[PDB]
Amino acid sequence: RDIALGSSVVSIKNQALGGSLLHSHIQTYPDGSNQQQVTCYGYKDANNEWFFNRERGLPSWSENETDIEYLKPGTSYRLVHKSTGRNLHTHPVAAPVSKTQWEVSGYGDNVVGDNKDNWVIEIMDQRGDEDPEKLHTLTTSFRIKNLEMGCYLAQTGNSLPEWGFRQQEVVCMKNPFKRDKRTWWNIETHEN
Numbered sequence: 001r002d003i004a005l006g007s008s009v010v011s012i013k014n015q016a017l018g019g020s021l022l023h024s025h026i027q028t029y030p031d032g033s034n035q036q037q038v039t040c041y042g043y044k045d046a047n048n049e050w051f052f053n054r055e056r057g058l059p060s061w062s063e064n065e066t067d068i069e070y071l072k073p074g075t076s077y078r079l080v081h082k083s084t085g086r087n088l089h090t091h092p093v094a095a096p097v098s099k100t101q102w103e104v105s106g107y108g109d110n111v112v113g114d115n116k117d118n119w120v121i122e123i124m125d126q127r128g129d130e131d132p133e134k135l136h137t138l139t140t141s142f143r144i145k146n147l148e149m150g151c152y153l154a155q156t157g158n159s160l161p162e163w164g165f166r167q168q169e170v171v172c173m174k175n176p177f178k179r180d181k182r183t184w185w186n187i188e189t190h191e192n
Contacts, residue, residue, distance in 0.1 A: 001190065003135040005052045005069045006061025009082055009191045012050055014040055014155040015141060015184035020168060021048040022153075022185075024081040024106045030163050033093045036086050036106030039167035040155045048189075049082040053110075055118050060110045071135045076118040076147055085109050087117040088153075090146050090172040097158040101171035102151055118147040124184060137190040143183050146172055154182040 003010065012022040023041035028034050041048060053061055055076035071077065079088035086106030093103040107113055125141040126132050135142065144153040151172035158169040176183050 001137050002131070003052070003071045003137065003187060003190065005054065005071055005077065006065075007051075007063075007068070007192055008071075009049050009051050010137075010187045011048045011189040012185050013188040014182065015186060016155060016157070016181040018157060018168075019155055019181070021188065022050060022170065023048050023167060024084060024086065026084060027164070029096060029103065029105065032096060032103045033091060033105055035089070035103075036084065037160075037164055038081075038088065038104045038106055038170045039160060039164055040170055041167050047081075047083050050088075051080050051082055053078040053080050053087075056113055056115055071121060073121045073123045073133065073135075073142070076120055078113070078117045079119055079144070081106050087113050088119060089113070089117050090149050090151060091116055092149075095156075095169065095171040096160060096164075097169045098156045098171050101154070101156070101173050102149065104153065104170045104172050116146060116148045119153075120145045120147055124178070135187065137187045139186070141184050141186055143178075144185060150174075152176055152183045153185070154180070156182060
């Protein structure tokens with residue numbers, strides 16, 4: 001099974017030891033940008049659900065489209081938090097705990113946003129043999145790179161303070177080692 005843009009609702013699990021699910025919620029950062037927090041969380045929840053949308057400026061996905069569009073490594077996408085409708089976002093703002101890395105937030109919606117809402121998938125490993133060019137549920141390991149920034153989405157290992165419910169810090173890491181697993185993700189749950 002393959003992941004498509006719009007109609008695949010996914011959870012995204014980090015591959016480091018201690019890795020957990022990409023998460024967001026209405027709470028905002030007290031410092032930094034004051035934007036919506038993004039974290040990793042360890043338990044099943046609706047706030048772990050994401051879907052991929054088109055790059056900024058293209059028409060947003062709807063249920064009335066002509067074809068299924070499979071996610072392609074190399075192509076720009078917007079990673080949308082299903083519960084809040086905010087886009088995964090980064091910027092040159094110091095992360096809350098890992099202060100030499102960049103803060104990751106939830107920003108905008110379909111109309112409001114900007115070029116830092118665009119991310120690119122890089123396939124690092126495929127276990128078993130379906131299309132090597134496609135994202136598969138729980139066998140494809142991938143990095144999520146911010147197109148503008150050039151940085152990679154990562155669960156650092158640090159916990160947030162109680163303003164972030166002591167969830168795991170997520171940052172955009174500058175210049176990591178390609179095999180750092182903090183920066184490695186897979187699709188865990190996939191609902192159509």
